[PDB]
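tool_call predict_complex ligand=S-adenosyl-L-homocysteine
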Amino acid sequence: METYEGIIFACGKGGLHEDARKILQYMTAKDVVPSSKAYTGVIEAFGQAALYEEALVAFNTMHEVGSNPSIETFHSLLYSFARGGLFKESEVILSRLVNSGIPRNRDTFNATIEAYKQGGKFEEAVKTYVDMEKSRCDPDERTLEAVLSVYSCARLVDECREQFEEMKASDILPSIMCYCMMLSVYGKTESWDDVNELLEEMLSNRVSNIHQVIGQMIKGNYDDDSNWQIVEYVLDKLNSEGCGLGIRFYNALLDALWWLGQKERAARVLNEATKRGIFPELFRKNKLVWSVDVHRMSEGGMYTALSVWLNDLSDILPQLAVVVSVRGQLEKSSAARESPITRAAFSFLQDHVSSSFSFTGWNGGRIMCQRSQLKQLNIVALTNS
Amino acid sequence: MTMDIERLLLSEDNRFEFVNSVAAEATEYVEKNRDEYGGTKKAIFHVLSNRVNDLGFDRPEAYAESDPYKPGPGYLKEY
Amino acid sequence: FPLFQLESADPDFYKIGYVRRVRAYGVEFKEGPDGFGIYASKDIEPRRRARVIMEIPHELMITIRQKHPWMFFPDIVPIGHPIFDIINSTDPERDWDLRLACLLLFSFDREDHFWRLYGDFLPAADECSSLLLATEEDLAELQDPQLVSTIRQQQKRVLEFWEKNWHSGVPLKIKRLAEDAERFIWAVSIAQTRCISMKTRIGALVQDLNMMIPYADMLNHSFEPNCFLHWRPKDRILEVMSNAGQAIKKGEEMTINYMPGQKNNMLMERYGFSTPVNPWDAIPFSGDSRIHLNSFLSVFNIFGLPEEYYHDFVDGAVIAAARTLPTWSDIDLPPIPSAERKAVKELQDECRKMLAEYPTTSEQDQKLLDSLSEARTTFATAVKYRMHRKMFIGKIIKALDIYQERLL
Amino acid sequence: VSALERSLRLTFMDELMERARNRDPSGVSEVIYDMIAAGLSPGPRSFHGLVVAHALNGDEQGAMHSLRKELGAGQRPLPETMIALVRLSGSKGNAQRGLELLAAMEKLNYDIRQAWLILVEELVRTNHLEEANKVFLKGARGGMRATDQLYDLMIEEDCKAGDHSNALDISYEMEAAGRFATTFHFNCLLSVQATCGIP
Ligand SMILES: Nc1ncnc2c1ncn2[C@@H]1O[C@H](CSCC[C@H](N)C(=O)O)[C@@H](O)[C@H]1O
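tool_result ok
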């Protein structure tokens, strides 16, 4: 029990779903009933790879073997759903947590804000933060980062200033993720004065090494063959808290680069993430489907993903080219086609390949291009400002 | 019930297995609902009335009938 | 408050049986243009066991042993009567209908016999649907050379028997039974269309009998019957029993299975009728193209073993389609959808090739039947037969189209 | 359903069923994720191909996992899909799982008689006669009537193994169903009775 749970935790931490599945099969093949904690590690790994179907099967199997889910199990699902913006499934857990006798802790509130944010529900995201303070609790550093992303996403420059300065008002030294979100909201409004003001703060950074290297590489100082090894050195050091922290770091970084005009640099940063296992669902290239999955990405990251995907399309035929913007129960509804990600991807595709990618009549969160229309198709310019 | 018993025995090849089957079905009634039998409703009478109703005919349950002209409690009809 | 809120048969039809211990429970005899029938006079609620619908005493029947020697139960032929010699001269296998016809005509001549009265409710020569009464023009409407030749042999066999045994030198007690060939042909037609064959025990003797049973020969045929026949040896009563646990609504027709496992051409040869929902009808396919038997059965919810197919659009024709279509099966190998579409397309072409063999179509035959005004009973029966076969082939084309699409 | 959706489902189900028949459960999983990427919802016949692919490669755990995926997706498994799992369980001698699946088919309101017949024959074929008798008697005592071929199979195999107690129980149930014993069945019982030392 101790060895099985130890290995599965590592698989769930690093998002190695294939290894986690084999440990579960090995335990069953030896007539061993895995513990409730062991299944939670398997559920964690599937959520790291956006394999929601296999994650909910393991959750279903927990009750079958009598290993009822613990509080940590309902957190593995919430963080898995939060990254994809599946607030419909997040509310199912929340409506289940109140019935299961589990009070809402702080971690539950953070996932709720993150799920609503990624799902485009900006009004409901701040309401959770509004209702969180009424219930007392104690917002942590990620909660401040959770609500800062909401304001940064909906282009609130003055709200983002107040949120960001208060982070350092308590001598917290906000992480590199919050700095990259400041660059996005300043880069979205073309506020080039504030961008240079924040960059000089990240250039000195005598205390934190990651801010210095990442801040330097954004400006383009580290774009040399030998000078890209230092940037890679930081990425390998950050590639030790698992895929959970990595996806948050790359989403903010690509968002900052795209809004600052460093669109060619964002292409190489995304290429650095994929080889490290980040965004394993991003691309599929077989004879049937050529797909790009952007439901767990930021707006800047999605644009970078589409730009590379479109350029690679023109190089080469599959039966279909699809863009997965909504991946959940919201697909079977009209709300998915009104999602901010779905509209942004379609708007991005409209003025890059003319009217070649149209919606689907059978799914709200898909943007397809038939094989016949693929014949009638760089397509996107990737340059640094 | 005498005519009903003869009616049921016309559909039976052997009257001894009919007796055993009725007793077997009556035993099942008592195990299922113990307190409802032994007084006005007898299990064997219930079996016979059920088997007549299974043929599609109508009989009162367990052939139980009561005197409607009894002058209140405590009075026994005298033969 | 209560203040503010198919014709019935002749009343004497049931009465003549009723005064002779015939009992009917919850059913009524109703008469229509197509003939007599038995219908539930009320809602017959389900029970744990089969319900008694009708009871027919043995003494009102005309029965003869299926197997030699020929004994009659009840014994009505006097010793030395010349009718036994006529019965005894028959072929034991093929001439069961001739033996019953001789008994039937003999029974009509007896003053005390019940069938002297019951014979007046039998269909006449122009009302019986038996193909023995069909003219050569009626057989021309069958569009089935095999069935036509079978009927012609039946008519030839029946006629030659009358000519041999009812010649000029026979006694008057024989002449008055069948004064003309048509009278004897009608008797054989009644024998074929109404005979019920059962294994019965009478006293200590168990034997197979060919039986003419009054009031039970009014039950129509169905391949999904709600009733069955049951011989009660102890009091010598034939019971008509509704299926145990099956609810029967008021007005629903009470039916039995005349001929389990038999095709429409067999129903036409024996009873002079056919059904479009016969689950045993077959269609000759080449076998070049085959569909997946397991998929076809599951698409239409047909369960059970092949010899006991049942449905949980789907009717007896789809069940017949499952048994007659060319099928393949490889335990649990799944079918490729694109290869199954080629088979379905090729099977539908062969189905249309056979519909094109008929000069008319199914709906043209249906409107022809509605336009009739002076048509013999057998003529309409012949048209219904070919129309039912067209409806069966058309049902297969529809079933294949549904199956081809539900395989996605 | 539009014409474009039908065209894609045909080519997706063509590829999926060409890998289930190829005994490639991994490939059948890739196509299902291709369907999800295209937005097509995998129906009962798409998960049937996943169950069959695992079942054909003697994989009871993967096939059971595929069934959980189908149930977890809200789809209703086909009667043929359950029969593939029941037959697979019998081939491995897993009578408990075979009986659990039969209970599921009854819950799904299917007809378990044919699947019960298949389960018993697999256990007999795979030399699990002791397990086969347990499954057969439970069905027979439950009211199901077996085939005459399976009745003659169960009686004969039990008597060849010296198991008169099971062979006599089955023959009693065979007549209760309505199939009378013949000289063949009696000769099977006599083959064991003649060696008991009590004439
Ligand atoms: N299902 C059915 N469809 C059409 N005709 C049927 C039928 N079942 C029985 N018949 C007809 O009924 C005859 C059997 S005797 C049944 C009673 C008959 N209708 C009568 O009035 O005397 C057959 O000759 C056949 O023509």
